[PDB]
Scaffold this active site. Structure first.
Site, PDB file in Angstrom:
ATOM      1  N   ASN A   1       9.470   4.894  10.806  1.00 16.60           N
ATOM      2  CA  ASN A   1       8.613   3.790  10.396  1.00 16.60           C
ATOM      3  C   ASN A   1       7.132   4.071  10.624  1.00 16.60           C
ATOM      4  O   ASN A   1       6.326   3.130  10.663  1.00 16.60           O
ATOM      5  CB  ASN A   1       9.046   2.498  11.086  1.00 16.60           C
ATOM      6  CG  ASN A   1      10.290   1.943  10.475  1.00 16.60           C
ATOM      7  OD1 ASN A   1      10.607   2.237   9.312  1.00 16.60           O
ATOM      8  ND2 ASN A   1      11.031   1.141  11.245  1.00 16.60           N
TER       9      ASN A   1
ATOM     10  N   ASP B   1       7.309  -1.093   7.697  1.00 15.76           N
ATOM     11  CA  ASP B   1       8.617  -1.711   7.879  1.00 15.76           C
ATOM     12  C   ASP B   1       8.571  -2.873   8.862  1.00 15.76           C
ATOM     13  O   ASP B   1       9.018  -2.760  10.016  1.00 15.76           O
ATOM     14  CB  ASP B   1       9.730  -0.745   8.262  1.00 15.76           C
ATOM     15  CG  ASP B   1      11.096  -1.383   8.078  1.00 15.76           C
ATOM     16  OD1 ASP B   1      11.117  -2.614   7.770  1.00 15.76           O
ATOM     17  OD2 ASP B   1      12.114  -0.672   8.246  1.00 15.76           O
TER      18      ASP B   1
ATOM     19  N   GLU C   1       0.836  -1.195   0.000  1.00 14.88           N
ATOM     20  CA  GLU C   1       0.000   0.000   0.000  1.00 14.88           C
ATOM     21  C   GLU C   1       0.879   1.256   0.000  1.00 14.88           C
ATOM     22  O   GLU C   1       1.832   1.365   0.777  1.00 14.88           O
ATOM     23  CB  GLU C   1      -0.838  -0.030   1.280  1.00 14.88           C
ATOM     24  CG  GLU C   1      -1.735   1.163   1.473  1.00 14.88           C
ATOM     25  CD  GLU C   1      -2.576   1.018   2.723  1.00 14.88           C
ATOM     26  OE1 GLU C   1      -2.180   0.274   3.643  1.00 14.88           O
ATOM     27  OE2 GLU C   1      -3.662   1.623   2.761  1.00 14.88           O
TER      28      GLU C   1
ATOM     29  N   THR D   1      17.122   0.072  15.985  1.00 15.87           N
ATOM     30  CA  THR D   1      17.935   1.290  16.040  1.00 15.87           C
ATOM     31  C   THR D   1      18.222   1.663  17.488  1.00 15.87           C
ATOM     32  O   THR D   1      17.289   1.756  18.277  1.00 15.87           O
ATOM     33  CB  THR D   1      17.171   2.413  15.343  1.00 15.87           C
ATOM     34  OG1 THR D   1      16.997   2.053  13.970  1.00 15.87           O
ATOM     35  CG2 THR D   1      17.931   3.733  15.439  1.00 15.87           C
TER      36      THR D   1
ATOM     37  N   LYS E   1       9.707   3.442  15.452  1.00 13.77           N
ATOM     38  CA  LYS E   1      10.444   4.702  15.512  1.00 13.77           C
ATOM     39  C   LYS E   1       9.769   5.652  14.531  1.00 13.77           C
ATOM     40  O   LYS E   1       9.014   5.195  13.676  1.00 13.77           O
ATOM     41  CB  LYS E   1      11.921   4.503  15.130  1.00 13.77           C
ATOM     42  CG  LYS E   1      12.107   3.844  13.747  1.00 13.77           C
ATOM     43  CD  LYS E   1      13.592   3.660  13.492  1.00 13.77           C
ATOM     44  CE  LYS E   1      13.860   2.953  12.153  1.00 13.77           C
ATOM     45  NZ  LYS E   1      15.327   2.850  11.861  1.00 13.77           N
TER      46      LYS E   1
ATOM     47  N   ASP F   1      10.695  -2.604  15.613  1.00 16.84           N
ATOM     48  CA  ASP F   1      11.426  -1.506  14.977  1.00 16.84           C
ATOM     49  C   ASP F   1      10.572  -0.255  14.963  1.00 16.84           C
ATOM     50  O   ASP F   1      10.590   0.507  13.988  1.00 16.84           O
ATOM     51  CB  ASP F   1      11.841  -1.888  13.543  1.00 16.84           C
ATOM     52  CG  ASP F   1      13.012  -1.077  12.990  1.00 16.84           C
ATOM     53  OD1 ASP F   1      13.800  -0.478  13.756  1.00 16.84           O
ATOM     54  OD2 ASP F   1      13.174  -1.103  11.731  1.00 16.84           O
TER      55      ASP F   1
HETATM   56  C1  LIG Z   1      16.204   6.436   7.957  1.00 16.69           C
HETATM   57  C2  LIG Z   1      15.592   7.049   6.890  1.00 16.69           C
HETATM   58  N1  LIG Z   1      14.471   6.588   6.315  1.00 16.69           N
HETATM   59  C3  LIG Z   1      13.966   5.466   6.856  1.00 16.69           C
HETATM   60  N2  LIG Z   1      12.813   4.993   6.316  1.00 16.69           N
HETATM   61  C4  LIG Z   1      12.200   5.554   5.111  1.00 16.69           C
HETATM   62  C5  LIG Z   1      10.847   4.929   4.872  1.00 16.69           C
HETATM   63  N3  LIG Z   1      11.000   3.483   4.704  1.00 16.69           N
HETATM   64  C6  LIG Z   1      10.090   2.751   4.000  1.00 16.69           C
HETATM   65  C7  LIG Z   1       8.996   3.351   3.373  1.00 16.69           C
HETATM   66  C8  LIG Z   1       8.011   2.530   2.835  1.00 16.69           C
HETATM   67  C9  LIG Z   1       6.798   3.074   2.183  1.00 16.69           C
HETATM   68  C10 LIG Z   1       5.640   2.311   2.071  1.00 16.69           C
HETATM   69  C11 LIG Z   1       4.533   2.850   1.447  1.00 16.69           C
HETATM   70  N4  LIG Z   1       4.501   4.081   0.931  1.00 16.69           N
HETATM   71  C12 LIG Z   1       5.618   4.813   1.039  1.00 16.69           C
HETATM   72  C13 LIG Z   1       6.773   4.357   1.647  1.00 16.69           C
HETATM   73  C14 LIG Z   1       8.211   1.158   2.957  1.00 16.69           C
HETATM   74  N5  LIG Z   1       9.275   0.633   3.555  1.00 16.69           N
HETATM   75  N6  LIG Z   1      10.220   1.430   4.073  1.00 16.69           N
HETATM   76  C15 LIG Z   1      11.685   2.862   5.843  1.00 16.69           C
HETATM   77  C16 LIG Z   1      12.036   3.898   6.903  1.00 16.69           C
HETATM   78  N7  LIG Z   1      14.474   4.783   7.893  1.00 16.69           N
HETATM   79  C17 LIG Z   1      15.595   5.293   8.425  1.00 16.69           C
END
Ligand SMILES: c1cnc(N2CCN(c3cc(-c4ccncc4)cnn3)CC2)nc1
Length: 280
Positions: free
Chosen positions: A143, A160, A93, A179, A140, A138
């Site tokens: 997420n 996530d 999604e 983290t 945070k 996880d």
């Molecule tokens: C440092 C920096 N950014 C991050 N993010 C960035 C975001 N991420 C994502 C986003 C999606 C997702 C799902 C649906 N529509 C949009 C996006 C899916 N899966 N992972 C993981 C966490 N984590 C640490």
């Protein structure tokens, strides 16, 4: 378990890249047969059994199995799974309003009402997960995604599920570590883990929502982890002088070292404030 092995480009067109994790890339995509839009998460597979790069097939299959189980307004859902020699591709999604992390950076800190409006939704999503005996492991701000960041009371979905595990015995004892700023002491200490670790993470998220500051953050990851294990946090007057005592009480009952004494998800919803990788 095996996944669809047709080329995903035969069925979807990809667009903007949305995120770039360690072993994962996320791109916006569009299904050809429906015109509907999704987020495609490409997870790199391990190239050998003994390889440190990529995600083991066991870990990918667990994430997929958990995602297939869930359907709730506050959790991301899974539409389809593809795979090829190099990647497993989750068609998820699409959540288009960005991370709670980036929303917070624009506001400095939230009011208690803005914080509880986000927290009520996070708690509802975690109540659903914990009801299914799913520990997320996880949680945070990165997420937590917003559906639309330009409305007064943005709606959120937890994303996530790469560390999530089913807890069928009340605890699990595997290699699990998120983290440093957000992990509970039992993670730092490599002790058996259960649903209670997520409740600690929620306490950390709440502190950050209210102050803009991370309660255990040190100058290095090892310092952060040492602070978490010692429960070395306090409410700084500069940030919290005008925060209600009930908000502080809520955080205090989550940031508890003994997991058995920490508030459960059910407890958190009845609390009066609410009631209506590791190495450098
Ligand atoms: C440092 C920096 N950014 C991050 N993010 C960035 C975001 N991420 C994502 C986003 C999606 C997702 C799902 C649906 N529509 C949009 C996006 C899916 N899966 N992972 C993981 C966490 N984590 C640490």
């Amino acid at each position: 378990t095996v996944f669809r092995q047709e080329n995903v480009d035969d069925y979807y067109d990809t667009g903007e890249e949305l995120g770039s994790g360690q072993f994962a890339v996320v791109k916006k995509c569009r299904e050809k047969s429906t015109g509907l839009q999704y987020a495609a998460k490409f997870i790199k597979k391990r190239r050998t059994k003994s390889s440190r790069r990529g995600v083991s097939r066991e870990d990918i299959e667990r994430e997929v199995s958990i995602l297939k189980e869930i359907q709730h307004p506050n959790v991301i859902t899974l539409h389809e799974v593809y795979e090829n020699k190099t990647d497993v591709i989750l068609i998820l999604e699409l959540v288009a309003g960005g991370e709670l992390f980036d929303f917070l950076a624009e506001k400095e800190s939230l009011t208690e009402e803005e914080a509880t409006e986000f927290l009520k939704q996070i708690l509802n999503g975690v109540y659903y997960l914990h009801s299914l005996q799913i520990a997320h492991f996880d949680l945070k701000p990165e997420n937590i995604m917003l559906l639309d960041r330009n409305v007064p009371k943005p709606r959120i979905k937890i994303i996530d599920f790469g560390l999530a595990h089913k807890i069928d015995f009340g605890n699990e004892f595997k290699n699990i570590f998120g983290t440093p700023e957000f992990v509970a002491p039992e993670i730092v200490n490599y002790e058996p883990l259960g649903l209670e670790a997520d409740m600690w993470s929620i306490g950390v998220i709440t502190y950050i929502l209210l102050s803009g500051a991370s309660p255990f953050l040190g100058d290095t990851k090892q310092e952060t982890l040492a602070n978490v294990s010692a429960v070395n946090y306090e409410f700084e007057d500069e940030y919290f002088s005008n925060t209600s005592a009930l908000a502080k009480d809520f955080i205090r009952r989550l940031l508890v070292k003994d997991p058995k004494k920490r508030m459960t998800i059910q407890d958190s919803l009845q609390h009066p404030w609410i009631k209506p990788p590791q190495f450098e």
